[PDB]
Amino acid sequence: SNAMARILKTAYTFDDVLLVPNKSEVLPNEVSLKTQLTKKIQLNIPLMSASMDTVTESKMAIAMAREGGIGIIHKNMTIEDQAREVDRVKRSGGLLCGASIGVTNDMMERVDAVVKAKVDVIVLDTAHGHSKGVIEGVKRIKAKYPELQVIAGNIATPEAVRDLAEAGADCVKVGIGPGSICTTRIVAGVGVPQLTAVMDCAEEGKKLGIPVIADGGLKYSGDIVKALAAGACAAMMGSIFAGCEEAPGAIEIYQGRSYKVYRGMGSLGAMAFVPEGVEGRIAYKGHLADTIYQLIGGIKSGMGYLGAPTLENLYENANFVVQTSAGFRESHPHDINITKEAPNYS
Amino acid sequence: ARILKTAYTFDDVLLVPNKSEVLPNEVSLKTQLTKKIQLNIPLMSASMDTVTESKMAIAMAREGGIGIIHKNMTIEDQAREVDRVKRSGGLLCGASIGVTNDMMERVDAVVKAKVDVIVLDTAHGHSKGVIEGVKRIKAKYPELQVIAGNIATPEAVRDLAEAGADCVKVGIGPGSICTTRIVAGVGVPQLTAVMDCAEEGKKLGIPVIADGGLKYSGDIVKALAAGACAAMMGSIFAGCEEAPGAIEIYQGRSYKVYRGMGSLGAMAKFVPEGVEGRIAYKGHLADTIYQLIGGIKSGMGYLGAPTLENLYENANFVVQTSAGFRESHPHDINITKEAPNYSV
Amino acid sequence: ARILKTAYTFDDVLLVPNKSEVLPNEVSLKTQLTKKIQLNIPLMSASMDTVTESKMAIAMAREGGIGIIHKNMTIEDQAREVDRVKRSGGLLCGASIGVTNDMMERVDAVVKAKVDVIVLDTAHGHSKGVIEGVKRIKAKYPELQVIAGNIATPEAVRDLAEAGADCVKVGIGPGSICTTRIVAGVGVPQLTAVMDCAEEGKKLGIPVIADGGLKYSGDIVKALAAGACAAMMGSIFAGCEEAPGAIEIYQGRSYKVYRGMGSLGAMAVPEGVEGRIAYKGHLADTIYQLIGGIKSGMGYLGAPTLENLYENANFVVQTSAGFRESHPHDINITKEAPNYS
Amino acid sequence: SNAMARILKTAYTFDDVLLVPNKSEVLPNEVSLKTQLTKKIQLNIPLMSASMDTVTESKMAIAMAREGGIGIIHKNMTIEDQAREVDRVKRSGGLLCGASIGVTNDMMERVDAVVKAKVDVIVLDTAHGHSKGVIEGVKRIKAKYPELQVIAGNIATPEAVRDLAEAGADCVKVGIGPGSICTTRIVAGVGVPQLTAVMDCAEEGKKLGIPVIADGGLKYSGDIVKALAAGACAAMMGSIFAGCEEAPGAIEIYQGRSYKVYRGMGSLGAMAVPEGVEGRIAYKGHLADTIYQLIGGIKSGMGYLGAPTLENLYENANFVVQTSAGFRESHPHDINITKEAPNYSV
Numbered sequence A: 001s002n003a004m005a006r007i008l009k010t011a012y013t014f015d016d017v018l019l020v021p022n023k024s025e026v027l028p029n030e031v032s033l034k035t036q037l038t039k040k041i042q043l044n045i046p047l048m049s050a051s052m053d054t055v056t057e058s059k060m061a062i063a064m065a066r067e068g069g070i071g072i073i074h075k076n077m078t079i080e081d082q083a084r085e086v087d088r089v090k091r092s093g094g095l096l097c098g099a100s101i102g103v104t105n106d107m108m109e110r111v112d113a114v115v116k117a118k119v120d121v122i123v124l125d126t127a128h129g130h131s132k133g134v135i136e137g138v139k140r141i142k143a144k145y146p147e148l149q150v151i152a153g154n155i156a157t158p159e160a161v162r163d164l165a166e167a168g169a170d171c172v173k174v175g176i177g178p179g180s181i182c183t184t185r186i187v188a189g190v191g192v193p194q195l196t197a198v199m200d201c202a203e204e205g206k207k208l209g210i211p212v213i214a215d216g217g218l219k220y221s222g223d224i225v226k227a228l229a230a231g232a233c234a235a236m237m238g239s240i241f242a243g244c245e246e247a248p249g250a251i252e253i254y255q256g257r258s259y260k261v262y263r264g265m266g267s268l269g270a271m272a273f274v275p276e277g278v279e280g281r282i283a284y285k286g287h288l289a290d291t292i293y294q295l296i297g298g299i300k301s302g303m304g305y306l307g308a309p310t311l312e313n314l315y316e317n318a319n320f321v322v323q324t325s326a327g328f329r330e331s332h333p334h335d336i337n338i339t340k341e342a343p344n345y346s
Numbered sequence B: 001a002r003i004l005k006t007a008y009t010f011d012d013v014l015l016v017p018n019k020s021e022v023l024p025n026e027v028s029l030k031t032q033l034t035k036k037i038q039l040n041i042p043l044m045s046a047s048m049d050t051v052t053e054s055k056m057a058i059a060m061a062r063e064g065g066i067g068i069i070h071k072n073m074t075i076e077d078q079a080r081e082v083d084r085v086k087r088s089g090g091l092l093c094g095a096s097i098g099v100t101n102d103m104m105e106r107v108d109a110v111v112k113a114k115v116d117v118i119v120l121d122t123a124h125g126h127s128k129g130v131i132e133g134v135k136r137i138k139a140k141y142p143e144l145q146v147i148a149g150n151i152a153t154p155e156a157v158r159d160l161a162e163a164g165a166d167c168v169k170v171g172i173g174p175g176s177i178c179t180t181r182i183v184a185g186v187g188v189p190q191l192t193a194v195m196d197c198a199e200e201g202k203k204l205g206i207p208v209i210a211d212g213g214l215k216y217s218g219d220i221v222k223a224l225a226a227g228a229c230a231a232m233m234g235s236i237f238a239g240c241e242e243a244p245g246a247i248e249i250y251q252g253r254s255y256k257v258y259r260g261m262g263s264l265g266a267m268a269k270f271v272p273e274g275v276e277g278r279i280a281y282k283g284h285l286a287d288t289i290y291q292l293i294g295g296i297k298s299g300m301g302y303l304g305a306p307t308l309e310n311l312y313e314n315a316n317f318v319v320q321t322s323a324g325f326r327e328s329h330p331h332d333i334n335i336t337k338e339a340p341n342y343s344v
Numbered sequence C: 001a002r003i004l005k006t007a008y009t010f011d012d013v014l015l016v017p018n019k020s021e022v023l024p025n026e027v028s029l030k031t032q033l034t035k036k037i038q039l040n041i042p043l044m045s046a047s048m049d050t051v052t053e054s055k056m057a058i059a060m061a062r063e064g065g066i067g068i069i070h071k072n073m074t075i076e077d078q079a080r081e082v083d084r085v086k087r088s089g090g091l092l093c094g095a096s097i098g099v100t101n102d103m104m105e106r107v108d109a110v111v112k113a114k115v116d117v118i119v120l121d122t123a124h125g126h127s128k129g130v131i132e133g134v135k136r137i138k139a140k141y142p143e144l145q146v147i148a149g150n151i152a153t154p155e156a157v158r159d160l161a162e163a164g165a166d167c168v169k170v171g172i173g174p175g176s177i178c179t180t181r182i183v184a185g186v187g188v189p190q191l192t193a194v195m196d197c198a199e200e201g202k203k204l205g206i207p208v209i210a211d212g213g214l215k216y217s218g219d220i221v222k223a224l225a226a227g228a229c230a231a232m233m234g235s236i237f238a239g240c241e242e243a244p245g246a247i248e249i250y251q252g253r254s255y256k257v258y259r260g261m262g263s264l265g266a267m268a269v270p271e272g273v274e275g276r277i278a279y280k281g282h283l284a285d286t287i288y289q290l291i292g293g294i295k296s297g298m299g300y301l302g303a304p305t306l307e308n309l310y311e312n313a314n315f316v317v318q319t320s321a322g323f324r325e326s327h328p329h330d331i332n333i334t335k336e337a338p339n340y341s
Numbered sequence D: 001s002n003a004m005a006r007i008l009k010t011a012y013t014f015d016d017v018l019l020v021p022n023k024s025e026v027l028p029n030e031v032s033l034k035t036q037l038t039k040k041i042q043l044n045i046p047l048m049s050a051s052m053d054t055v056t057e058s059k060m061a062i063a064m065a066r067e068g069g070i071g072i073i074h075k076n077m078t079i080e081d082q083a084r085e086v087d088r089v090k091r092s093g094g095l096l097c098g099a100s101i102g103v104t105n106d107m108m109e110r111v112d113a114v115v116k117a118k119v120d121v122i123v124l125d126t127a128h129g130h131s132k133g134v135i136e137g138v139k140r141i142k143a144k145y146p147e148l149q150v151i152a153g154n155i156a157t158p159e160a161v162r163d164l165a166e167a168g169a170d171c172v173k174v175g176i177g178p179g180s181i182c183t184t185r186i187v188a189g190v191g192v193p194q195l196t197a198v199m200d201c202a203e204e205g206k207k208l209g210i211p212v213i214a215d216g217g218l219k220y221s222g223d224i225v226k227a228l229a230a231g232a233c234a235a236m237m238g239s240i241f242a243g244c245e246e247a248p249g250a251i252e253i254y255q256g257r258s259y260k261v262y263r264g265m266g267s268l269g270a271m272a273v274p275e276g277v278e279g280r281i282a283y284k285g286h287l288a289d290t291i292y293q294l295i296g297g298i299k300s301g302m303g304y305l306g307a308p309t310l311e312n313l314y315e316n317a318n319f320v321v322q323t324s325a326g327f328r329e330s331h332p333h334d335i336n337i338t339k340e341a342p343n344y345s346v
C-alpha cells in the first residue's frame, strides 16, 4: 500500500556541495568584496577573526581592519583589559573594532566599558544564542544603547534568526558545532551541518532584512565562497588565522616545524568542568596579509566563475550541487605526489 | 525480500537546537525504567562478566542509575551479588536471566535476594523462548519487574508487551564487541531501532532501553531524544575501577579486559557472535558518570528541555553525511591536551 | 531568667541498636561538608596552633578528611601553608579567619593560594562581627565556601545561614582545653547543642559541624547520629606526629603540647588552658581506630550511610551508674587497647 | 709547556661491565645496605635524590629520608624558600636533609639560612667541581662552620678527589656528563664514562678516607650495584625519581600515558649556552614502589656476590667487560614481551 515513512532531512556542510559555474562577463579583478556587516557597518572584505583568546586581541584586530575586515576582541580578560584592547585598535587610525560579551551578571558593565572605548559592534556571544538570556541581553543592551550595533549568536535555525531580530539584533551569527576545535556535537549531540545552517538562516534573514555571519568550519578559500553564496554577509574564522604572526601566543618550534597554540573557548584550558572544545597546535603561517591575500584571490576567482560583480549578485545567482565522498575525492587533487608547496592548498 | 528504508545509527544524525528557557543546571534527569522503578539518571551498566558485578552495581546505584548483575556465574553466586547491593542501602539492583532449563531456579534465587528487576536477556528477544519465559515469570511473580530483550522492531515491542514485559531492551548488533551483524547478517542501525521501538512503546505504555553502540555523551542524548527511557553501556564502563577484572599495564598504558558475552572466552566459562579485547583504564566510575551527565544536561539545555519527556517531545533530528561527520568532530587540529569527554 | 531544659553531652547518652543488614566493612562514610565540598570521611582537625599546620592538613586530606590551618601566623605564612597543601596533589584544605581589621586581606591571600574552604572562627559566632564578616566575604567571593562559628543555638544557625554561611560549626565550651563555661558561665552541653542546631540546619539545608568535646570513637558516632555532617577534633589529633610541636620525653613517657587558642600562651583574661597529652604516633593509626569504631556503630544502627544514621537514631539517657556500666569495670586491665584509654 | 695531547685509556660506563658472581653464604634478605655518606652521616640505604627542580623539594626529601636515603633540596629558589624547604623536612621527624649551594656572590648567605634551618649536609654543586671557585668555597664554608658536612662536586678524576679533600670536603660527588638530560659531553667535548670515573675516584677516596657519590647515568637497579661495587658510598639519581608522585610537577596525560616533566638544571628552561635538555618521562606512582624494586635488585646483587655489607661488596667485586653483543645477551632477547615487569622496561 502507501507506506508510512520517517521524515528526516539531510543537512550539508561545505564539503558536501559545489557551486555551478554561471555565464560570466566579469574578471576576478573587477569584482567588489564590500559587504554590510550591519546596516550601519560596511566591510571592504567579508572576513572576520574569531573572538578567541588564541585568535584575536588588539594586534590581530588592527591587522584585520587594515586588510579591510574586522576582529572581535575576546572576553577572556578583565573588563578593564578588554576596554584597553578595543581602545588600542580605535586609536590606531579609526579602524573598526568588535568586542565579545557574555550572558553574565556583569554583562552591562562590560558593555559600558567597551562602549566608552568606542567599540563599533559588540557580539553577544554564547554557546546557545536561541535562549532567553541572549534574547533578554539584546533587549537590555538596545534599550540602553539604541544605536550600538549588536551581533547575537550563535544559532542554527530560521526561528532563531526571527527571535533574535525581534529582540533587536542588527546581525546574527550562525554556527553550532562546526568549529575545528569544537566538540559540542560530540558531547551534547546537537548542531546543524554548517552550509545548510547558513542557507536556511540567511534565507530568513533576507526576508527580515537582517544579515547573518557564517561562523566556523571554514578551511579553504572555496569554503568561504560557498558560505557567501549561501547568503552570509561575512565569514568568521578561528583556525585559518590562529597560526598567523598577529594572533596571540608564541611561535613554538618542534622537530623543524613552527606552531602556534589554538584552542576552543570551551576547552578546559580556556575555561580555567564539562568542556565543549579541545586544545592543540596548528602550523605557523606568517603574517596575516599573506593569508588574506590567498583568501581574497580565491573569493574573487569563485565570483568570476559565477559572473558575480558583487557579493549580493553572488548570492542571487548561485546554484549548488551535492557531491558524494567520491566526488570529494575528485574535487581535491588526486593520484599525484605533490612535491611543491602551494600557498592556498595543503 | 524487500529493502524497507535507510536505517541510521547515532553518528548519522544530529539534534537541532530549540529555543531554550532552561539552563543545563535546571534540568531533571529522572526517568521511569518501569512504571514501578524510577532512576535519578537514565544510565545502566551492561550485564556482562567484564562490566557489572556487585561493585559496579553499587557504584551505579549510588550515582542514580542501575547495574544489571551478569549471569555467567552460579545461581548462588548471583543471588549473593544481588544481596550485597540491596543490603548497601536499599540501592536498586538488576539481574540477568537466560532462557535455560534452570531459568526459574535462578529467578527464585535473585527474588529471594530482593532483586528489583530481572532482565530476561537473549541474543534474539523476539522469540518464543523469551515470550514464554516472560509469561512463566509473570505468572509466578506477577509484581516482579521484568525487562526483556534484545529486540529491534516495533513488532517485538508489541509481542513482548503482550507477554507481560514491563520494559524492553533494544539493540541487535550495535555493541562495540559484537559481531552478530557480520556473522549472521542481521541487525538494525541503533538510532532507527530506538526511534522505531520507543515510538511503539509509547503507544503501549512500555518503556524501552537503548542498549549498545554508545561511545560519547552526545550519543546518549540522541538515544534519549529518540524516546528511550534509559541507555545501557558496556564499553563506556568496562574500563572503570569498579568493573570486574584487574588493571593491566602494557607499554606505559593501563588497560582492562572487555569481551562480548557471545565471544569464545565468555562462553567457555562453537560459533561466536562477539570478540575479546582490551580498552583503556578510566579510573573511578564517578568521573565517567560526571562527564556523561554533564553532556546530557548540556544537550537538554540546547533543546530547551527541563525533563527527558520534553526532550523527546521537541527533538528534531537531521541526517549528516560523512563530510558532516568530519565537521562535527574536531578537525584540522593537532590535539595536544587530554579532554575528559573526548578522545580520538 | 528561665531554665529551658536539661542539656546533654556525649557521655549522657547511648544509641539504641537497630535491625541491621550491613556489616561494618560494607559501610560508606562519605559526607557533604558543604553543598560543594564532599569528604570521604567525616573528620576534621581543629584550627589550633598545636593541631593543624600544612603537615597535619595534608595527612588529614590523604585520609579522606580535611584540616583547617590555624591563623596564629602572618597572612603570608598562612597562604604559604595553604599553598603547600594544595600543591601536594589536589588535596582539600581549609584555613581559619578571624573578625579582624585585616580579615579581607587574609581571605584574599588564602583564596589566592586556592583554599577550598574558609572558617570564620570566633569565640562567639552568633555576633554582629561574624554575621557582617560572612556578608562581606560572600559579597566579594560568592563561590567561596564559608564555615562560620562557633555557635550553640538554632537561632544562631538561622542567622548565619541567612548571612550566607555554607556550613556552621557548633560548640561553645565543650573543648578539652576550654574554660569558657567556667570563666564566663556560658555554653550548651555538646550533644544537645549539636542535635538542636542540626535539626534547624536540616530545615534550612545547611550542614552543621560538631566541634569539640570528643574523646572516643563512639562519641563521634553520637555526634553524627545527632545530625552533624562532620566532627572536628583537637585533643584526639594533637598527640599525633603530624601536629605541630616536638615530642617531649619525661619519666619514660612521650608527650606533645596542647593548648587552647584562648589560653595565655597562644594569645602571646584567658578562656583556655595549656598542657600536655600523650604522644600517639602517626595520624593514620588514630584515624584507622576512629573509622573502625564509627563503622561498628553504623553496623549496630543498620546505617549503610550517614544520612540514614540521623533518621534512624534513637538515644537513651544514662545515669552516672549507667556510665560506669558502659565503661569496662571491675577488671584490672593489663594489656593496652588501641581504641580505649 | 712541552706536554702533548694524548689518549690515556679506554673508560667504561655501567652498560660496558658485569659483576662476576662470588661464592655466597648470604641470602639477599640477610644483607645490610647501611652506608656512611660522610664520617658523621649514616644512611640506611645508599640512595640519594638529585638536587634538581624537577626531582627534589621537601616532599621528595621527606619521602627519601623515610625510606632510609636522603634528598638534596635544589637551589633554583630564593634563599628563604630553600631554608623553608629544609625546615619542613627537619620538623617532619628529624629526618635527614640536604641542600644544594652554588658558587655565587650570595653563597654564604644561602649557607647561613639552611644552617639555621638545621640542614645536615650541603652540596656545593657546580658543573666543574675541580675548580678554584669550588675549592675556595669549601674552604670558606669549613672555616665558618667547621662541623657542617659538605659534599662537593661534580668531578671525575682522582686529582679532583685529592684537591677537594685537601680543601676540607667531607665527601665528593662524581659525574661529568653521564646524566640522562645532560649534553655536557656533546657540547663541550668533556667527561669521563661513569663506571671508570667512579672506580678511579673511589680508589683515591679510600686512600684518603673520603667517600664518593656516584651521580648520574643510572637506569636500572643493577647499575646501582655496579656503582656501589666500584666503591661509591651512595648513588644519586634524577631520572629514576623524577616520575614519582613525590617529585615536583603535575601529572600530564597524553594519549593514555601519564608523564612528568624532567629537565637538566643546565637546560634553557631551568635557567630562568645550555648543557641540558628538557622533556618528559613516564609517571611511576609513589616513590616507595620504586625504592622497593631498587633495593630488591641491590640485595639480589649482593646475594650473588656473597656480600653481607657494602664494604664487603667493594672489597670482593670483580668486573668483566662485555661487548655490544654481550649487552644484547644480557638484556632479554628474542622474546615478544607481553607483560610489564616492575623492574624492567623497554
Ligand SMILES: C=C(C)c1cccc(C(C)(C)NC(=O)Nc2ccc(Cl)c(N[C@H]3O[C@H](CO)[C@@H](O)[C@H]3O)c2)c1
Pocket: A103, A126, A127, A128, A129, A131, A132, A133, A134, A184, A265, A266, A267, A274, A275, A276, A277, B020, B022, B023, B024, B297, B298, B299, B300, B301, B302
Ligand atoms: C561555543 C561554545 C560551545 C562554548 C564556548 C565557551 C564555553 C562553553 C561551555 C563549555 C561552557 N559550554 C556551554 O556553555 N554549554 C552550554 C550548553 C547548553 C546551554 Cl542552554 C548553554 N547556555 C548558554 O547560554 C546561556 C545564556 O542564555 C548561558 O548560560 C550559556 O551557558 C551553554 C561552550
Ligand SMILES: C=C(C)c1cccc(C(C)(C)NC(=O)Nc2ccc(Cl)c(N[C@H]3O[C@H](CO)[C@@H](O)[C@H]3O)c2)c1
Pocket: B099, B122, B123, B124, B125, B127, B128, B129, B130, B180, B261, B262, B263, B271, B272, B273, B274
Ligand atoms: C548477544 C549476543 C549476540 C550473544 C550473547 C551470548 C551468546 C551468544 C551466542 C554466541 C550463543 N549466540 C546466539 O545465542 N545466537 C543466536 C542466534 C539466533 C537465535 Cl534465534 C538465538 N536464540 C536465542 O534466543 C532464544 C530464545 O528462545 C534462545 O534460545 C537463544 O538461543 C541465538 C550471543
Ligand SMILES: C=C(C)c1cccc(C(C)(C)NC(=O)Nc2ccc(Cl)c(N[C@H]3O[C@H](CO)[C@@H](O)[C@H]3O)c2)c1
Pocket: C099, C122, C123, C124, C125, C127, C128, C129, C130, C180, C261, C262, C263, C269, C270, C271, C272
Ligand atoms: C573561647 C574561644 C574559642 C577563644 C579563642 C581565642 C581567644 C579567646 C579569648 C580568650 C580572647 N576570648 C574571647 O574572645 N572571648 C569573647 C567573649 C565574648 C565575645 Cl561576645 C567575644 N567576641 C565576639 O565579639 C564580636 C561581636 O561582633 C564577635 O566577632 C566575636 O569575636 C569574645 C577565646
Ligand SMILES: C=C(C)c1cccc(C(C)(C)NC(=O)Nc2ccc(Cl)c(N[C@H]3O[C@H](CO)[C@@H](O)[C@H]3O)c2)c1
Pocket: D103, D126, D127, D128, D129, D131, D132, D133, D134, D184, D265, D266, D267, D273, D274, D275, D276
Ligand atoms: C651540571 C651542569 C653541567 C650544569 C648545571 C647548571 C647549569 C650549567 C650551565 C649551563 C650554566 N653550564 C655551565 O655552568 N658550564 C660550565 C662550563 C665550564 C666551567 Cl669551568 C664552569 N664553571 C662552573 O664551575 C665554577 C666553580 O668555580 C662556577 O663558576 C661555574 O661556572 C661552568 C651546567
Ligand SMILES: O=c1[nH]cnc2c1ncn2[C@@H]1O[C@H](COP(=O)(O)O)[C@@H](O)[C@H]1O
Pocket: A050, A051, A052, A154, A175, A177, A178, A179, A180, A181, A182, A183, A184, A215, A216, A217, A218, A236, A237, A238, A239, A240, A263, A264, A265, A266, A267, A276, A277, A278
Ligand atoms: O570551545 C568551543 N566549542 C565550540 N565552538 C567554539 C569553541 N571555541 C570557539 N568556538 C567557535 O568556533 C569558531 C572557530 O571555528 P574554526 O574557524 O573552524 O576554527 C569560533 O568563531 C566560535 O564560533
Ligand SMILES: O=c1[nH]cnc2c1ncn2[C@@H]1O[C@H](COP(=O)(O)O)[C@@H](O)[C@H]1O
Pocket: B046, B047, B048, B150, B171, B173, B174, B175, B176, B177, B178, B179, B180, B211, B212, B213, B214, B232, B233, B234, B235, B236, B259, B260, B261, B262, B263, B273, B274, B275
Ligand atoms: O558477544 C556479544 N555479541 C553481541 N552483543 C553483545 C555481546 N555481549 C554483549 N552484547 C551487547 O552489547 C552491549 C554493550 O555494547 P557497548 O556498550 O557498545 O560495548 C551489551 O549491553 C549487550 O547488549
Ligand SMILES: O=c1[nH]cnc2c1ncn2[C@@H]1O[C@H](COP(=O)(O)O)[C@@H](O)[C@H]1O
Pocket: C046, C047, C048, C150, C171, C173, C174, C175, C176, C177, C178, C179, C180, C211, C212, C213, C214, C232, C233, C234, C235, C236, C259, C260, C261, C262, C263, C271, C272, C273
Ligand atoms: O582556648 C579555647 N577556649 C575555648 N575553646 C577552644 C579554645 N581553643 C580551641 N577551642 C575549641 O576547642 C576545640 C577542640 O576541642 P577538643 O577536640 O575537645 O580538644 C577546637 O576545635 C575549638 O572549637
Ligand SMILES: O=c1[nH]cnc2c1ncn2[C@@H]1O[C@H](COP(=O)(O)O)[C@@H](O)[C@H]1O
Pocket: D050, D051, D052, D154, D175, D177, D178, D179, D180, D181, D182, D183, D184, D215, D216, D217, D218, D236, D237, D238, D239, D240, D263, D264, D265, D266, D267, D275, D276, D277
Ligand atoms: O643540565 C644539566 N647538564 C648536565 N648534567 C646535569 C644537568 N642537570 C643535572 N645534571 C646531573 O645529572 C644528574 C641526574 O642524572 P640522571 O639520574 O641520569 O637523570 C644530576 O644529579 C646532576 O649531577
